[PDB]
Amino acid sequence: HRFRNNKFLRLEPDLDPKVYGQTETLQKQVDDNFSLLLAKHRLDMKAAAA
Amino acid sequence: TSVKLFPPVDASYPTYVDFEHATRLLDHFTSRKRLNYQRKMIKKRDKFQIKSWDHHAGEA
Amino acid sequence: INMDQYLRMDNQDTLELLVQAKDNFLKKDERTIPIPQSVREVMYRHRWDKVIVDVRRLVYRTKNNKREQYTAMVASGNQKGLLGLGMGSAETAQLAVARAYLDSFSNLAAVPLYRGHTVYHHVEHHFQRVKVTLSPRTSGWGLRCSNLFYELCSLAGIRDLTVDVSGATRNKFFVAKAFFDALQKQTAPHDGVEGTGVYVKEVVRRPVVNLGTYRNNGTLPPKEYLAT
Amino acid sequence: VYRNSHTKRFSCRNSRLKYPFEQIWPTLQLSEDDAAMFRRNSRQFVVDLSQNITLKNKFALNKATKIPHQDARALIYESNLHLDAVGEHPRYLKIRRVTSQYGSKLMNVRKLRLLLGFKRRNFVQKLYEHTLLQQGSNKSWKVLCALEAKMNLAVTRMGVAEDVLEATHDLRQNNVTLNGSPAQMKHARYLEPADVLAVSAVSLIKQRICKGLFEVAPNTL
Amino acid sequence: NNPEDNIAIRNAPQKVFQLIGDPRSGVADDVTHNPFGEITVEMVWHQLKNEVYWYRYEFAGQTTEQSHRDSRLSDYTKNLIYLLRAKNPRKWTIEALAEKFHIRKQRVLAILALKEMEAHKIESGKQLQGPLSPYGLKVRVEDLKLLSLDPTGCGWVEP
Amino acid sequence: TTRRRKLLGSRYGARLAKKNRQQFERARVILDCYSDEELRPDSPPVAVKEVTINTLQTMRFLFPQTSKEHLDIKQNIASYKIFSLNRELLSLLPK
Numbered sequence: 056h057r058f059r060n061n062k063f064l065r066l067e068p069d070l071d072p073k074v075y076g077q078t079e080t081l082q083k084q085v086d087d088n089f090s091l092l093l094a095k096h097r098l099d100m101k102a103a104a105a
Numbered sequence: 106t107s108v109k110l111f112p113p114v115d116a117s118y119p120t121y122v123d124f125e126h127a128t129r130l131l132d133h134f135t136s137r138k139r140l141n142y143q144r145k146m147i148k149k150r151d152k153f154q155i156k157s158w159d160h161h162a163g164e165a
Numbered sequence: 166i167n168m169d170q171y172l173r174m175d176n177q178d179t180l181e182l183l184v185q186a187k188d189n190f191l192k193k194d195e196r197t198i199p200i201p202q203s204v205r206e207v208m209y210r211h212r213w214d215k216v217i218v219d220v221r222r223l224v225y226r227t228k229n230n231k232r233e234q235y236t237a238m239v240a241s242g243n244q245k246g247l248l249g250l251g252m253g254s255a256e257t258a259q260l261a262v263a264r265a266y267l268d269s270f271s272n273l274a275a276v277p278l279y280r281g282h283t284v285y286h287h288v289e290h291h292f293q294r295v296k297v298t299l300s301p302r303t304s305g306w307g308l309r310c311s312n313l314f315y316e317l318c319s320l321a322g323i324r325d326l327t328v329d330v331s332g333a334t335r336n337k338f339f340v341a342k343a344f345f346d347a348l349q350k351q352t353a354p355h356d357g358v359e360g361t362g363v364y365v366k367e368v369v370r371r372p373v374v375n376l377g378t379y380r381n382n383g384t385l386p387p388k389e390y391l392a393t
Numbered sequence: 394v395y396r397n398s399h400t401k402r403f404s405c406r407n408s409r410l411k412y413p414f415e416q417i418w419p420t421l422q423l424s425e426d427d428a429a430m431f432r433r434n435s436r437q438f439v440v441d442l443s444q445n446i447t448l449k450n451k452f453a454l455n456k457a458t459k460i461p462h463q464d465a466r467a468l469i470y471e472s473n474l475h476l477d478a479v480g481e482h483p484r485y486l487k488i489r490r491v492t493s494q495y496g497s498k499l500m501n502v503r504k505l506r507l508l509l510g511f512k513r514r515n516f517v518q519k520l521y522e523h524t525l526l527q528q529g530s531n532k533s534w535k536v537l538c539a540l541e542a543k544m545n546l547a548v549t550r551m552g553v554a555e556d557v558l559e560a561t562h563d564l565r566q567n568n569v570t571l572n573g574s575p576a577q578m579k580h581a582r583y584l585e586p587a588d589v590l591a592v593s594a595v596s597l598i599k600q601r602i603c604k605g606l607f608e609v610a611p612n613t614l
Numbered sequence: 615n616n617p618e619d620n621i622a623i624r625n626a627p628q629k630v631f632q633l634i635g636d637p638r639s640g641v642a643d644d645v646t647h648n649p650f651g652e653i654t655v656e657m658v659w660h661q662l663k664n665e666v667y668w669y670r671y672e673f674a675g676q677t678t679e680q681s682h683r684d685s686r687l688s689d690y691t692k693n694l695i696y697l698l699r700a701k702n703p704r705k706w707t708i709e710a711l712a713e714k715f716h717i718r719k720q721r722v723l724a725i726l727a728l729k730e731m732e733a734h735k736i737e738s739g740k741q742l743q744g745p746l747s748p749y750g751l752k753v754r755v756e757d758l759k760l761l762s763l764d765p766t767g768c769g770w771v772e773p
Numbered sequence: 774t775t776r777r778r779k780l781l782g783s784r785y786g787a788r789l790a791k792k793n794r795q796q797f798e799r800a801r802v803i804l805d806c807y808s809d810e811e812l813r814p815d816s817p818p819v820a821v822k823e824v825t826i827n828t829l830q831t832m833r834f835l836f837p838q839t840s841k842e843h844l845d846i847k848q849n850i851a852s853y854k855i856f857s858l859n860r861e862l863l864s865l866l867p868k
């Protein structure tokens with residue numbers, strides 16, 4: 056696997072709690088998971104429709 | 106929130122305390138007048154008593 | 166300073182230090198340290214404490230000048246059931262104290278105590294022109310005595326007692342000697358018990374005070390005596 | 394009394410130590426020079442061993458882990474010619490006299506005043522008299538129980554104040570309640586085994602704790 | 615119930631019966647020492663940056679061991695006590711819960727009170743809000759089963 | 774010169790009884806208010822059905838091992854949580 060260090064294939068680094076806040080970081084992590092699921096539905100619909 | 110449970114069985118302080126030396130000095134300044142007043146009030150804890158309102162000189 | 170080395174030294178095993186220290190102490194000559202080898206071995210089984218009792222100065226006059234001589238007494242004893250008194254004389258106070266301290270280890274003796282904290286019964290002793298009285302007290306009550314006797318009680322391990330001394334107490338050597346002799350006049354329940362034919366059993370009985378004490382405090386004695 | 398003896402740096406004085414002062418405030422920041430002065434009471438040099446040893450090492454050499462509370466005095470302030478003073482001639486060993494008790498007894502009473510938050514002597518004297526009448530067989534433990542029953546010391550144990558002095562200021566501002574309402578005779582009463590303490594200045598105390606541990610908090614959530 | 619893995623069994627009352635003499639002619643109780651213990655002190659910590667020493671006093675230090683565990687029970691254990699009490703108050707009395715978790719009755723009741731207050735905050739909507747919402751769990755007392763470590767080794771069985 | 778309003782306190786139970794009577798009744802049964810004769814209320818005890826707990830530590834702080842024992846505990850809690858959410862959802866899905 057070429058991405059040895061980037062094991063989770065992330066596009067952006069996790070927010071630093073000391074700068075953005077613990078609550079903000081936790082919300083960001085939840086949003087990231089939902090985006091991955093939403094993108095999956097988004098690719099499938101486009102392929103099926105076009 | 107905190108709740109106390111019972112008389113302490115352990116304690117920690119940021120220094121060594123010699124209780125025997127501290128009490129030996131304090132035993133030299135004891136007042137018999139203050140002790141007697143405390144003894145009398147121990148026997149009159151209940152306000153709703155006839156014997157708690159007799160005739161006496163002073164506070165107790 | 167190097168904090169890492171400071172931390173390393175603080176949290177270290179002391180077995181190596183103990184072996185080196187013990188070997189050095191036991192290999193010293195009898196002149197610098199006149200303590201017998203047998204006593205040195207026992208010194209590693211307990212924790213010890215010492216205190217100066219008194220220092221006296223004697224003067225002898227001659228044709229031209231005066232000769233000064235010092236005498237001192239030092240008491241040492243392990244925390245529980247060991248006590249000894251030593252006397253030393255020298256041309257200076259510092260030397261007299263050192264000789265007395267060394268002599269104390271040659272005079273160690275056992276002190277009988279009830280449960281290791283008080284005396285068995287009331288004791289009255291008459292050392293020459295001195296009177297000492299010892300009264301047992303309940304565990305945890307504390308010590309009621311003079312400052313000199315308070316130090317002596319710490320060495321022996323006595324925790325609850327009342328001591329009263331009267332008479333010609335100018336010479337503190339006699340006062341300490343009288344206290345030492347009083348402790349040795351106690352009797353124990355197990356002395357010659359085989360010749361009694363009975364079972365000597367410890368019992369629980371609360372001590373009482375005199376009537377005047379009850380009246381002043383406004384309290385009552387045990388019901389066993391008030392029964393009417 | 395705007396003295397130096399009423400500041401944390403010089404609050405405690407002990408004449409039996411190489412450096413007469415003693416540090417008892419666990420949150421006080423000392424300078425390099427001040428730390429060096431206090432460190433002289435911790436390290437001692439042994440001639441025969443030719444090494445430096447610490448107070449903790451001395452306890453280990455004496456095989457002391459749990460000892461009677463009256464026996465710790467003989468370990469902290471005294472020395473022995475067979476464990477920690479090997480190689481010194483007996484002529485130069487220090488032995489105390491019966492005339493040093495007064496300084497020690499006065500020092501310990503000052504310690505009780507400091508722990509309670511710079512209380513007056515009459516305050517401590519009445520506390521001792523109070524325990525004399527309460528039930529219990531061991532006088533020493535009764536004194537300890539009285540100290541714990543004090544409200545300001547209990548607030549410190551909760552972990553919401555840096556020290557007893559800060560806890561006392563919180564009580565004067567009514568930042569802590571007793572049994573649902575602000576306490577009465579808060580400086581003079583004793584707490585009982587069923588009392589409940591709660592923080593009323595929630596926003597203030599939460600900020601205090603967060604700031605204290607901000608630097609020791611991990612950077613990964 | 616073995617001393618190796620039961621601290622409570624190690625910290626148990628001792629039955630003392632000591633004698634001096636001859637049982638055939640005469641005996642007396644041995645009262646030359648105190649086998650019941652006394653108040654002790656110990657040095658616990660030393661801060662090398664501020665030169666601060668910490669001393670701990672114990673009422674029964676010579677007859678107890680690892681007394682610091684009682685006040686440092688995990689959050690999982692506390693929730694288990696709260697759930698057992700709610701499930702069956704008839705069997706899970708204060709006496710039974712105290713014996714089960716090797717603590718005192720006062721501690722058991724105090725733990726229940728604090729957990730009850732926290733539950734009201736969660737239900738009211740004052741705690742576990744936003745990203746941490748999923749960690750507020752509502753449990754029906756009927757739908758609760760307690761497993762036991764009956765089989766030797768790893769593995770928890772329902773009965 | 775303080776803008777802080779005066780605080781007159783009240784016992785926790787006193788405030789709860791006026792805000793949520795159901796929670797107050799449940800607490801009495803849990804806290805063993807019916808065992809002592811002196812403190813026994815006149816109203817009959819109410820049965821306890823549902824409770825709420827916090828599992829943040831048990832899920833992300835206390836069980837790090839990879840053994841089946843630790844994995845099973847986390848899975849059971851997660852499964853039970855989903856059931857609770859689904860029951861709430863079913864109550865709203867129907868038109």
Ligand SMILES: [K+]
Pocket residue numbers: 512513514
């Ligand atoms: K003062």
Ligand SMILES: [Mg+2]
Pocket residue numbers: 329330331
């Ligand atoms: Mg007299």
